[PDB]
Design a protein around this ligand. Structure first.
Ligand SMILES: [Mg+2]
Ligand SMILES: [Mg+2]
Ligand SMILES: [Mg+2]
Ligand SMILES: [Mg+2]
Ligand SMILES: [Mg+2]
Ligand SMILES: [Mg+2]
Ligand SMILES: [Mg+2]
Ligand SMILES: [Mg+2]
Ligand SMILES: [Mg+2]
Ligand SMILES: [Mg+2]
Ligand SMILES: [Mg+2]
Ligand SMILES: [Mg+2]
Ligand SMILES: [Mg+2]
Ligand SMILES: [Mg+2]
Ligand SMILES: [Mg+2]
Ligand SMILES: [Mg+2]
Ligand SMILES: [Mg+2]
Ligand SMILES: [Mg+2]
Ligand SMILES: [Mg+2]
Ligand SMILES: [Mg+2]
Ligand SMILES: [Mg+2]
Ligand SMILES: [Mg+2]
Ligand SMILES: [Mg+2]
Ligand SMILES: [Mg+2]
Ligand SMILES: [Mg+2]
Ligand SMILES: [Mg+2]
Ligand SMILES: [Mg+2]
Ligand SMILES: [Mg+2]
Ligand SMILES: [Mg+2]
Ligand SMILES: [Mg+2]
Ligand SMILES: [Mg+2]
Ligand SMILES: [Mg+2]
Ligand SMILES: [Mg+2]
Ligand SMILES: [Mg+2]
Ligand SMILES: [Mg+2]
Ligand SMILES: [Mg+2]
Ligand SMILES: [Mg+2]
Ligand SMILES: [Mg+2]
Ligand SMILES: [Mg+2]
Ligand SMILES: [Mg+2]
Ligand SMILES: [Mg+2]
Ligand SMILES: [Mg+2]
Ligand SMILES: [Mg+2]
Ligand SMILES: [Mg+2]
Ligand SMILES: [Mg+2]
Ligand SMILES: [Mg+2]
Ligand SMILES: [Mg+2]
Ligand SMILES: [Mg+2]
Ligand SMILES: [Mg+2]
Ligand SMILES: [Mg+2]
Ligand SMILES: [Mg+2]
Ligand SMILES: [Mg+2]
Ligand SMILES: [Mg+2]
Ligand SMILES: [Mg+2]
Ligand SMILES: [Mg+2]
Ligand SMILES: [Mg+2]
Ligand SMILES: [Mg+2]
Ligand SMILES: [Mg+2]
Ligand SMILES: [Mg+2]
Ligand SMILES: [Mg+2]
Ligand SMILES: [Mg+2]
Ligand SMILES: [Mg+2]
Ligand SMILES: [Mg+2]
Ligand SMILES: [Mg+2]
Ligand SMILES: [Mg+2]
Ligand SMILES: [Mg+2]
Ligand SMILES: [Mg+2]
Ligand SMILES: [Mg+2]
Ligand SMILES: [Mg+2]
Ligand SMILES: [Mg+2]
Ligand SMILES: [Mg+2]
Ligand SMILES: [Mg+2]
Ligand SMILES: [Mg+2]
Ligand SMILES: [Mg+2]
Ligand SMILES: [Mg+2]
Ligand SMILES: [Mg+2]
Ligand SMILES: [Mg+2]
Ligand SMILES: [Mg+2]
Ligand SMILES: [Mg+2]
Ligand SMILES: [Mg+2]
Ligand SMILES: [Mg+2]
Ligand SMILES: [Mg+2]
Ligand SMILES: [Mg+2]
Ligand SMILES: [Mg+2]
Ligand SMILES: [Mg+2]
Ligand SMILES: [Mg+2]
Ligand SMILES: [Mg+2]
Ligand SMILES: [Mg+2]
Ligand SMILES: [Mg+2]
Ligand SMILES: [Mg+2]
Ligand SMILES: [Mg+2]
Ligand SMILES: [Mg+2]
Ligand SMILES: [Mg+2]
Ligand SMILES: [Mg+2]
Ligand SMILES: [Mg+2]
Ligand SMILES: [Mg+2]
Ligand SMILES: [Mg+2]
Ligand SMILES: [Mg+2]
Ligand SMILES: [Mg+2]
Ligand SMILES: [Mg+2]
Ligand SMILES: [Mg+2]
Ligand SMILES: [Mg+2]
Ligand SMILES: [Mg+2]
Ligand SMILES: [Mg+2]
Ligand SMILES: [Mg+2]
Ligand SMILES: [Mg+2]
Ligand SMILES: [Mg+2]
Ligand SMILES: [Mg+2]
Ligand SMILES: [Mg+2]
Ligand SMILES: [Mg+2]
Ligand SMILES: [Mg+2]
Ligand SMILES: [Mg+2]
Ligand SMILES: [Mg+2]
Ligand SMILES: [Mg+2]
Ligand SMILES: [Mg+2]
Ligand SMILES: [Mg+2]
Ligand SMILES: [Mg+2]
Ligand SMILES: [Mg+2]
Ligand SMILES: [Mg+2]
Ligand SMILES: [Mg+2]
Ligand SMILES: [Mg+2]
Ligand SMILES: [Mg+2]
Ligand SMILES: [Mg+2]
Ligand SMILES: [Mg+2]
Ligand SMILES: [Mg+2]
Ligand SMILES: [Mg+2]
Ligand SMILES: [Mg+2]
Ligand SMILES: [Mg+2]
Ligand SMILES: [Mg+2]
Ligand SMILES: [Mg+2]
Ligand SMILES: [Mg+2]
Ligand SMILES: [Mg+2]
Ligand SMILES: [Mg+2]
Ligand SMILES: [Mg+2]
Ligand SMILES: [Mg+2]
Ligand SMILES: [Mg+2]
Ligand SMILES: [Mg+2]
Ligand SMILES: [Mg+2]
Ligand SMILES: [Mg+2]
Ligand SMILES: [Mg+2]
Ligand SMILES: [Mg+2]
Ligand SMILES: [Mg+2]
Ligand SMILES: [Mg+2]
Ligand SMILES: [Mg+2]
Ligand SMILES: [Mg+2]
Ligand SMILES: [Mg+2]
Ligand SMILES: [Mg+2]
Ligand SMILES: [Mg+2]
Ligand SMILES: [Mg+2]
Ligand SMILES: [Mg+2]
Ligand SMILES: [Mg+2]
Ligand SMILES: [Mg+2]
Ligand SMILES: [Mg+2]
Ligand SMILES: [Mg+2]
Ligand SMILES: [Mg+2]
Ligand SMILES: [Mg+2]
Ligand SMILES: [Mg+2]
Ligand SMILES: [Mg+2]
Ligand SMILES: [Mg+2]
Ligand SMILES: [Mg+2]
Ligand SMILES: [Mg+2]
Ligand SMILES: [Mg+2]
Ligand SMILES: [Mg+2]
Ligand SMILES: [Mg+2]
Ligand SMILES: [Mg+2]
Ligand SMILES: [Mg+2]
Ligand SMILES: [Mg+2]
Ligand SMILES: [Mg+2]
Ligand SMILES: [Mg+2]
Ligand SMILES: [Mg+2]
Ligand SMILES: [Mg+2]
Ligand SMILES: [Mg+2]
Ligand SMILES: [Mg+2]
Ligand SMILES: [Mg+2]
Ligand SMILES: [Mg+2]
Ligand SMILES: [Mg+2]
Ligand SMILES: [Mg+2]
Ligand SMILES: [Mg+2]
Ligand SMILES: [Mg+2]
Ligand SMILES: [Mg+2]
Ligand SMILES: [Mg+2]
Ligand SMILES: [Mg+2]
Ligand SMILES: [Mg+2]
Ligand SMILES: [Mg+2]
Ligand SMILES: [Mg+2]
Ligand SMILES: [Mg+2]
Ligand SMILES: [Mg+2]
Ligand SMILES: [Mg+2]
Ligand SMILES: [Mg+2]
Ligand SMILES: [Mg+2]
Ligand SMILES: [Mg+2]
Ligand SMILES: [Mg+2]
Ligand SMILES: [Mg+2]
Ligand SMILES: [Mg+2]
Ligand SMILES: [Mg+2]
Ligand SMILES: [Mg+2]
Ligand SMILES: [Mg+2]
Ligand SMILES: [Mg+2]
Ligand SMILES: [Mg+2]
Ligand SMILES: [Mg+2]
Ligand SMILES: [Mg+2]
Ligand SMILES: [Mg+2]
Ligand SMILES: [Mg+2]
Ligand SMILES: [Mg+2]
Ligand SMILES: [Mg+2]
Ligand SMILES: [Mg+2]
Ligand SMILES: [Mg+2]
Ligand SMILES: [Mg+2]
Ligand SMILES: [Mg+2]
Ligand SMILES: [Mg+2]
Ligand SMILES: [Mg+2]
Ligand SMILES: [Mg+2]
Ligand SMILES: [Mg+2]
Ligand SMILES: [Mg+2]
Ligand SMILES: [Mg+2]
Ligand SMILES: [Mg+2]
Ligand SMILES: [Mg+2]
Ligand SMILES: [Mg+2]
Ligand SMILES: [Mg+2]
Ligand SMILES: [Mg+2]
Ligand SMILES: [Mg+2]
Ligand SMILES: [Mg+2]
Ligand SMILES: [Mg+2]
Ligand SMILES: [Mg+2]
Ligand SMILES: [Mg+2]
Ligand SMILES: [Mg+2]
Ligand SMILES: [Mg+2]
Ligand SMILES: [Mg+2]
Ligand SMILES: [Mg+2]
Ligand SMILES: [Mg+2]
Ligand SMILES: [Mg+2]
Ligand SMILES: [Mg+2]
Ligand SMILES: [Mg+2]
Ligand SMILES: [Mg+2]
Ligand SMILES: [Mg+2]
Ligand SMILES: [Mg+2]
Ligand SMILES: [Mg+2]
Ligand SMILES: [Mg+2]
Ligand SMILES: [Mg+2]
Ligand SMILES: [Mg+2]
Ligand SMILES: [Mg+2]
Ligand SMILES: [Mg+2]
Ligand SMILES: [Mg+2]
Ligand SMILES: [Mg+2]
Ligand SMILES: [Mg+2]
Ligand SMILES: [Mg+2]
Ligand SMILES: [Mg+2]
Ligand SMILES: [Mg+2]
Ligand SMILES: [Mg+2]
Ligand SMILES: [Mg+2]
Ligand SMILES: [Mg+2]
Ligand SMILES: [Mg+2]
Ligand SMILES: [Mg+2]
Ligand SMILES: [Mg+2]
Ligand SMILES: [Mg+2]
Ligand SMILES: [Mg+2]
Ligand SMILES: [Mg+2]
Ligand SMILES: [Mg+2]
Ligand SMILES: [Mg+2]
Ligand SMILES: [Mg+2]
Ligand SMILES: [Mg+2]
Ligand SMILES: [Mg+2]
Ligand SMILES: [Mg+2]
Ligand SMILES: [Mg+2]
Ligand SMILES: [Mg+2]
Lengths: 275, 48
RNA sequence: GAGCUAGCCCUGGCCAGGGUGAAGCUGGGGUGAGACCCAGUGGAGGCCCGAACCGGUGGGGGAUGCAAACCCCUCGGAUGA
RNA sequence: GAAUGCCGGCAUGAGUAACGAUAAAGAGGGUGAGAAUCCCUCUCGCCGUAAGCCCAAGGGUUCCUACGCAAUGGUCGUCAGCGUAGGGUUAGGCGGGACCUAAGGUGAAGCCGAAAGGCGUAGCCGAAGGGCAGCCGGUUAAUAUUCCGGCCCUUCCCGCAGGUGCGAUGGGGGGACGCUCUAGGCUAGGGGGACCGGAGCCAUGGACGAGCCCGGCCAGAAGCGCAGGGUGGGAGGUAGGCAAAUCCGCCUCCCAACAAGCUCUGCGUGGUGGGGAAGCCCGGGUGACAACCCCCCGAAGCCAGGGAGCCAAGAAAAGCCUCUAAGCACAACCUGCGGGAACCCGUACCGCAAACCGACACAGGUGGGCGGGUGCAAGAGCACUCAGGCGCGCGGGAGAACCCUCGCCAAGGAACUCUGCAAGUUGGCCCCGUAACUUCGGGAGAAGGGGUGCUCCCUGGGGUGAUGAGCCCCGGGGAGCCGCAGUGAACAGGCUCUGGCGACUGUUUACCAAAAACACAGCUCUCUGCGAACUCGUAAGAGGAGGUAUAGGGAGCGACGCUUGCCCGGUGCCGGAAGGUCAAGGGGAGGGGUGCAAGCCCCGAACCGAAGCCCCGGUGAACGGCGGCCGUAACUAUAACGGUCCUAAGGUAGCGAAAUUCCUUGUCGGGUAAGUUCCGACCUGCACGAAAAGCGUAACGACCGGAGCGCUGUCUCGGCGAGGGACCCGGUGAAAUUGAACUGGCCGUGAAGAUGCGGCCUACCCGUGGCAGGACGAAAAGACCCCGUGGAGCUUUACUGCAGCC
RNA sequence: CGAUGUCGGCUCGUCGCAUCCUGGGGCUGAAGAAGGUCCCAAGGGUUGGGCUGUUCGCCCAUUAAAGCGGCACGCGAGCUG
RNA sequence: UGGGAGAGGGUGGUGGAAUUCCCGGAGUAGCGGUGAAAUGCGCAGAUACCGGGAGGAACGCCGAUGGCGAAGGCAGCCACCUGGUCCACCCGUGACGCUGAGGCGCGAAAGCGUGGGGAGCAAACCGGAUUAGAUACCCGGGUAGUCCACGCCCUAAACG
RNA sequence: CCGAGGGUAGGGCCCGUGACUGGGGCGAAGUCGUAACAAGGUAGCUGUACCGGAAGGUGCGGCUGGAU
């Protein structure tokens, strides 16, 4: 349930914030945070390579366990659910009976105090991780690896999930968050359930300053520029586009497909995304 | 108003200094030329 | 050549005073339970007035200047992009 | 002899402008060849959240003293940041280094690039961040937390004693963190005292007084006291913290828990060491054996790693503690004490400025800290003033025009003007009161009005004490007094009605544009399955992102409300294993050159052969587009209706003389005495129209229109007054410009606008203050225009390439 | 074109006369009063407002009258902009 | 107190038939549609047939002149939670009643807001026919919507 | 002191009127089509929604006050 404000300033009229209700602990595990090196969109040459970035709130990076097959058979108690500024999902602090402590992203329904485990023999319940070939067809799942032992890569954002659709040989068939039907190897790990914080998409930033807190610098339209700057630049007064809409670099940006055609993974994608 | 010369000794030595020139092909050609011309100073003097 | 200027990165610092009084909380009312209402408490905000500080709206002066952009009066922001 | 030529010299303008903030000067005494300008004394003025004091940059001897005045100083100069000389900067504790890491830089291993070089985990470097031991006073012409005095402290080495499984670059803990608000108790700082110390004073009508004036503290180890910070203890199990671990983590059990304890800091006290005013006297002496006490106010500072709340979720590494590993356990470490040892560089002076950045002793620019008192509601605001620092390095007169800045004005009151431009008005606090409309927040300080000083009397609550007095804070009720006037000076909104545009706070053309432009939350389209797309790079490598479709990139639109129609023929994009065209290559019918020949060499048909294009289809919040003619209804006019040509299809809703309307000041209505503007309508829209969005919209605006009230020197229509200039005298003394000049009017003439030619008229020689009509006045080899087979930026279905991609 | 600043306003005027008024006249389809038309005449005079950047013009209220032109469409080393 | 019938309501589950789409096989000259047609689809391999998969919505037979609810309304099946109601016994209370201005709550479809979901259907819309014309009826397409959650709207031939 | 009233400012209700505009009633001798009454030639009506020169059409759900 997103939280609204009374319109006591022009921005508070629309601004909405998360309720933060699932959060049980307001400080990160000190041994699991590292400094996050802000870039401003600059690469190692010092050049901007992603425009309109920088100036956001300072953040520490919490180390996330995107493997989990790391500790097959060792159960862990869900100790806390915390805020992570580096992702849309919440994160869950796990106290393994090992004594080892790890973070995973918090699935929907995850409860502080419950136990979770990973492995081929794990029960099919929210928070447990198994190789895909041991999770029943039709169950919704998240934190999915793309190739075995390379780490969870799919269905990681707030409220997202993938659904197991069937089996074929060494591979399973997943419906990804985007609706794409893709083959994933059966030895790839995944965690049962959907990612939590599903109301994330209902947040209304409310004012220009909110974007700035997030490190999003103002984006300026190509049509507001000059011909040296942008294909849409120039014209006396306002102008329509006068050509197929284009990026700052000239490629068309209304429909032009850009996935590389001879890519090897096409053998494993059944059906491109819909919508 | 604020003018263009705002002296800074660390900035001066780190930018125009002898060790800065030696790190770089163009910088070593500067020293070569200034020695060839007979300059009394090859590099700007900085107090340290 | 980024000691001017533009952006970003790391690490520090600064913003007199006054005003408005959001959520929440407590109490009372209300109800089958509620919604909700009232009072108190509370202290939110690219909130208000206004110095420092950051600006440069209108006018006047200056025009071989005090100054290769200044001066006076007035005016904008002043917890925030 | 000319090149707006080059270098130099020297003229003209000219004894002219100016002499750099309008904070301000006067006299006496001294020095000296010389004095408005140097020193001293008294008087006057100016700053006082500074125009005072401290620190960091930057500067580099400018610091102190003596002796000088050619030049530098906008005048003068005996003076000086100037000339010459001599002196002056003293640290284990202050800052930096012999410590740590941040971005970044560098870079064993490694990767990449024609060369030069580009990357790169570890490591290293890198600070105004982390860490770390000195406080107060005295002393010099000039340094002082540095010298000295008193009281403290740190590390290293060695030794003694006590204790302990000692031992690390390894494991762990800790260091370690946001923003806003904030408690308790302190301190800095401040106010008062009828109390304590003090040289003195009694004026000029009164006062010998509970008189006036002056001061009434600073540092301090242990110990103790007050206030806070931090921290549970024990055992067992243990598979995690790349070895080990008794540590840490996890599980279980038992005592402790807003407790005390243990520990650390702050504050107070504290042996001891200091300081110590006015006044008088010549920096020093005296005051003085100085006194050194009580009360109130009180931080944004301290306790601190305190507390609460919130979302945007807030460095690292070492010092430190703990664990163990090799090893070593005659060691080693810990603790106490003693003796010894403790290096390098900075230290002067300026530092909101005459010593820094601005060519200048330049009204500009420059980061941190302290920044007293009283009054005004508060305050760092305003006025005055303390300490302290200044009067701004040309002066003296005069009392015109004109200019600047300022004050007032009869009657009128916007009649001014493009415009109330400018200037008036309004102005703080308290109380009463307050409209349409609204997104219910607002609009709102709406509007509008009343109050405001002083004296006496009665009286309520709070803070500190103690519960009281005292002090301090917040009130209330009567009765009076004075003036033109009580926020009596300074600082402190004029208001309202109605349109356009943009939702809003923000951003912009450094130095002619601040806006209606950019941004903006929000809406939609589209790309991207992760070695993502995309971007930079030849590459390696990076950003994206230690992110993963509720994510990231591109595009347009731009809060919110109600909406966003029709055309897919062309262009784009997307889909289409058919077909057509299609390059290299394959293939080799057939033909050719040469040779005596085997052979060698060349041409070459059918057929096979990709992307692309053609072709089929989809697609508008993709590029874009969205008609004409004739006829027709009981008067006319008009045309719901019909016919017809064309098109891919002919503009829907809504709006409309509009930021769009040519004709145009359209027509009508409103407002005005009068309205090319304004508002409301109509619709023949030259040439609105739906995300280059359409129509609205509360609130917001140094945006641009129209009107009204208030009030005014804006004006009728000008007058007077003030200061700084202008003027005169002394001092110093520019500038652009300049063919040379002995340089008048008219009517003519002349390359067509004549001081210079003709004719006539007028005119003694030379200045000073003024005014701007001419010298086609100065300035700038015309911001327009054209020309040059001149240049550059930009576009595209111009040409031709290249990257990139297929 | 090695520059002759261009609309309008303000200020300051001066000139022409094809005269708007005032003075003197002839003719009249001039009874008077008032007008019409032409002649002489440049001495003086020739208002204040609403609109619009306007010149011009329309309009309001007056007037004896509310003249038309030239002077680089007079006048930016005089101002405005 | 002891029993009964019921699509009464809410929540979570779950079954099969059919339609559509996609994949594989097999097969070819039409299919579809109507009063008759055409648009449309189909040699780029449709329709018809077999196998596989995905997805949404509605529940055939039972089914009735039936049942339940205050009305709107409610229909595969299972479970849980829950309302009303009838019967028997005649056991308890002792008129505790009836109605009901206001109030409050519920309230088919369409519609609205936010977010999902989307097979079939289908306003608007495009096209083919029909017709004198046909902004209709018929046919081929087709977006909201129809479905779920939450919040609105509060209407009806909400009728016996 | 109170006080007729006057004055300044801001609200509330009512009436008259207004460029222009919306539909309504009546007239009828017109133009267009023919929506309802018969199965009215697509059974009708209905709430709502979207659309069309017009009556009206269609969607969704409802009623019979529907012929055969
Ligand atoms: Mg929630
Ligand atoms: Mg809100
Ligand atoms: Mg709120
Ligand atoms: Mg709310
Ligand atoms: Mg708002
Ligand atoms: Mg919240
Ligand atoms: Mg949460
Ligand atoms: Mg924190
Ligand atoms: Mg760490
Ligand atoms: Mg990075
Ligand atoms: Mg780098
Ligand atoms: Mg680099
Ligand atoms: Mg980019
Ligand atoms: Mg960037
Ligand atoms: Mg999170
Ligand atoms: Mg969220
Ligand atoms: Mg949003
Ligand atoms: Mg952020
Ligand atoms: Mg964005
Ligand atoms: Mg933009
Ligand atoms: Mg532009
Ligand atoms: Mg460029
Ligand atoms: Mg280009
Ligand atoms: Mg550019
Ligand atoms: Mg371009
Ligand atoms: Mg363009
Ligand atoms: Mg254009
Ligand atoms: Mg443009
Ligand atoms: Mg245009
Ligand atoms: Mg433009
Ligand atoms: Mg533009
Ligand atoms: Mg624009
Ligand atoms: Mg366009
Ligand atoms: Mg264009
Ligand atoms: Mg175009
Ligand atoms: Mg793959
Ligand atoms: Mg600087
Ligand atoms: Mg310098
Ligand atoms: Mg430096
Ligand atoms: Mg430095
Ligand atoms: Mg530097
Ligand atoms: Mg260097
Ligand atoms: Mg060298
Ligand atoms: Mg030199
Ligand atoms: Mg030499
Ligand atoms: Mg050099
Ligand atoms: Mg910092
Ligand atoms: Mg502030
Ligand atoms: Mg309150
Ligand atoms: Mg609370
Ligand atoms: Mg504010
Ligand atoms: Mg504020
Ligand atoms: Mg404000
Ligand atoms: Mg200005
Ligand atoms: Mg002004
Ligand atoms: Mg003035
Ligand atoms: Mg200038
Ligand atoms: Mg300049
Ligand atoms: Mg100024
Ligand atoms: Mg000023
Ligand atoms: Mg201001
Ligand atoms: Mg303000
Ligand atoms: Mg403030
Ligand atoms: Mg803040
Ligand atoms: Mg602000
Ligand atoms: Mg010659
Ligand atoms: Mg010359
Ligand atoms: Mg010259
Ligand atoms: Mg020359
Ligand atoms: Mg020369
Ligand atoms: Mg001469
Ligand atoms: Mg002169
Ligand atoms: Mg002055
Ligand atoms: Mg002198
Ligand atoms: Mg002298
Ligand atoms: Mg003196
Ligand atoms: Mg003063
Ligand atoms: Mg003061
Ligand atoms: Mg210097
Ligand atoms: Mg000194
Ligand atoms: Mg001299
Ligand atoms: Mg001299
Ligand atoms: Mg001199
Ligand atoms: Mg000077
Ligand atoms: Mg002398
Ligand atoms: Mg000097
Ligand atoms: Mg000496
Ligand atoms: Mg010492
Ligand atoms: Mg120091
Ligand atoms: Mg050493
Ligand atoms: Mg280091
Ligand atoms: Mg340091
Ligand atoms: Mg130190
Ligand atoms: Mg000390
Ligand atoms: Mg000294
Ligand atoms: Mg031992
Ligand atoms: Mg941390
Ligand atoms: Mg820090
Ligand atoms: Mg005080
Ligand atoms: Mg006497
Ligand atoms: Mg003291
Ligand atoms: Mg205490
Ligand atoms: Mg263990
Ligand atoms: Mg003394
Ligand atoms: Mg003594
Ligand atoms: Mg004594
Ligand atoms: Mg404060
Ligand atoms: Mg958040
Ligand atoms: Mg680090
Ligand atoms: Mg051993
Ligand atoms: Mg020990
Ligand atoms: Mg050494
Ligand atoms: Mg020193
Ligand atoms: Mg000085
Ligand atoms: Mg300053
Ligand atoms: Mg100073
Ligand atoms: Mg200069
Ligand atoms: Mg000076
Ligand atoms: Mg200066
Ligand atoms: Mg002080
Ligand atoms: Mg005041
Ligand atoms: Mg005040
Ligand atoms: Mg002020
Ligand atoms: Mg004082
Ligand atoms: Mg002076
Ligand atoms: Mg004079
Ligand atoms: Mg007057
Ligand atoms: Mg008036
Ligand atoms: Mg008046
Ligand atoms: Mg105006
Ligand atoms: Mg005032
Ligand atoms: Mg009103
Ligand atoms: Mg309201
Ligand atoms: Mg008021
Ligand atoms: Mg208003
Ligand atoms: Mg008085
Ligand atoms: Mg009390
Ligand atoms: Mg007064
Ligand atoms: Mg003042
Ligand atoms: Mg004000
Ligand atoms: Mg208004
Ligand atoms: Mg207008
Ligand atoms: Mg608008
Ligand atoms: Mg704006
Ligand atoms: Mg704008
Ligand atoms: Mg808006
Ligand atoms: Mg906006
Ligand atoms: Mg805005
Ligand atoms: Mg602001
Ligand atoms: Mg400019
Ligand atoms: Mg500018
Ligand atoms: Mg410039
Ligand atoms: Mg410029
Ligand atoms: Mg300007
Ligand atoms: Mg500007
Ligand atoms: Mg502005
Ligand atoms: Mg802009
Ligand atoms: Mg914009
Ligand atoms: Mg929008
Ligand atoms: Mg590139
Ligand atoms: Mg890389
Ligand atoms: Mg990356
Ligand atoms: Mg990374
Ligand atoms: Mg990281
Ligand atoms: Mg990402
Ligand atoms: Mg914009
Ligand atoms: Mg509205
Ligand atoms: Mg098209
Ligand atoms: Mg097309
Ligand atoms: Mg075939
Ligand atoms: Mg052959
Ligand atoms: Mg032959
Ligand atoms: Mg659309
Ligand atoms: Mg076209
Ligand atoms: Mg377009
Ligand atoms: Mg007719
Ligand atoms: Mg049109
Ligand atoms: Mg249409
Ligand atoms: Mg019109
Ligand atoms: Mg308009
Ligand atoms: Mg137009
Ligand atoms: Mg035209
Ligand atoms: Mg017009
Ligand atoms: Mg016009
Ligand atoms: Mg008109
Ligand atoms: Mg106007
Ligand atoms: Mg105008
Ligand atoms: Mg018309
Ligand atoms: Mg555009
Ligand atoms: Mg536009
Ligand atoms: Mg458009
Ligand atoms: Mg508001
Ligand atoms: Mg604005
Ligand atoms: Mg503005
Ligand atoms: Mg005047
Ligand atoms: Mg006067
Ligand atoms: Mg005067
Ligand atoms: Mg004067
Ligand atoms: Mg005067
Ligand atoms: Mg004389
Ligand atoms: Mg001569
Ligand atoms: Mg002539
Ligand atoms: Mg002559
Ligand atoms: Mg001659
Ligand atoms: Mg001659
Ligand atoms: Mg002559
Ligand atoms: Mg003459
Ligand atoms: Mg002249
Ligand atoms: Mg002239
Ligand atoms: Mg001449
Ligand atoms: Mg001239
Ligand atoms: Mg030129
Ligand atoms: Mg030239
Ligand atoms: Mg030229
Ligand atoms: Mg030219
Ligand atoms: Mg130009
Ligand atoms: Mg030309
Ligand atoms: Mg030519
Ligand atoms: Mg040519
Ligand atoms: Mg030629
Ligand atoms: Mg070119
Ligand atoms: Mg590309
Ligand atoms: Mg010319
Ligand atoms: Mg010339
Ligand atoms: Mg020429
Ligand atoms: Mg010239
Ligand atoms: Mg003027
Ligand atoms: Mg007459
Ligand atoms: Mg008569
Ligand atoms: Mg005559
Ligand atoms: Mg005359
Ligand atoms: Mg005359
Ligand atoms: Mg006019
Ligand atoms: Mg006109
Ligand atoms: Mg007219
Ligand atoms: Mg008359
Ligand atoms: Mg003329
Ligand atoms: Mg002319
Ligand atoms: Mg003309
Ligand atoms: Mg002229
Ligand atoms: Mg004229
Ligand atoms: Mg002129
Ligand atoms: Mg001018
Ligand atoms: Mg002019
Ligand atoms: Mg001139
Ligand atoms: Mg002139
Ligand atoms: Mg001239
Ligand atoms: Mg003007
Ligand atoms: Mg202009
Ligand atoms: Mg049945
Ligand atoms: Mg009984
Ligand atoms: Mg309903
Ligand atoms: Mg619906
Ligand atoms: Mg569908
Ligand atoms: Mg027809
Ligand atoms: Mg919809
Ligand atoms: Mg019925
Ligand atoms: Mg009366
Ligand atoms: Mg009919
Ligand atoms: Mg019918
Ligand atoms: Mg219609
Ligand atoms: Mg029609
Ligand atoms: Mg229809
Ligand atoms: Mg019914
Ligand atoms: Mg019937």
């Amino acid at each position: 349930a997103v939280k609204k404000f009374k319109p006591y300033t022009p921005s508070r009229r629309f601004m909405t914030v998360a309720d933060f209700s699932e959060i049980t602990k307001t400080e990160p595990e000190k041994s699991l945070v590292k400094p996050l090196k802000k870039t401003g969109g600059r690469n190692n040459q010092g050049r901007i390579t992603v425009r309109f970035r920088g100036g956001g709130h300072k953040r520490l990076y919490r180390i996330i366990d995107f493997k989990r097959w790391d500790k097959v058979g060792i159960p862990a108690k869900v100790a806390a659910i915390e805020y992570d500024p580096n992702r849309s999902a919440r994160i869950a602090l796990l106290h393994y009976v090992d004594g080892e402590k790890r973070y995973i992203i918090a699935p929907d329904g995850l409860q502080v105090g419950q136990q979770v485990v990973a492995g081929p023999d794990a029960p099919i319940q929210v928070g447990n991780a198994l190789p895909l070939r041991f999770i029943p067809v039709g169950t919704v799942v998240h934190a999915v690896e793309l190739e075995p032992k390379k780490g969870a890569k799919l269905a990681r954002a707030a409220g997202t999930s993938a659904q197991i659709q069937g089996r074929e040989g060494d591979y399973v068939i997943l419906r990804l968050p985007s609706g794409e039907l893709r083959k994933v190897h059966g030895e790839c790990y995944a965690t049962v359930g959907a990612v939590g914080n599903a109301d994330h998409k209902n947040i209304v930033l409310g004012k220009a300053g909110r974007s700035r807190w997030l490190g999003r610098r103002p984006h300026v339209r190509g049509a507001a520029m000059n011909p040296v700057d942008h294909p849409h630049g120039g014209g006396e007064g306002r102008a329509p586009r006068g050509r197929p809409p284009a990026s700052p670099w000239g490629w068309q940006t209304k429909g032009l497909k850009t996935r590389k055609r001879r890519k090897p993974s096409s053998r494993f994608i059944i059906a491109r995304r819909k919508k | 108003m604020k003018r263009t010369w705002q002296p800074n000794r660390r900035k001066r030595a780190k930018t125009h200094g002898f060790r800065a020139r030696m790190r770089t092909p163009g910088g070593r050609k500067v020293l070569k030329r200034r020695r060839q011309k007979g300059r009394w100073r090859l590099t700007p003097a900085v107090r340290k």
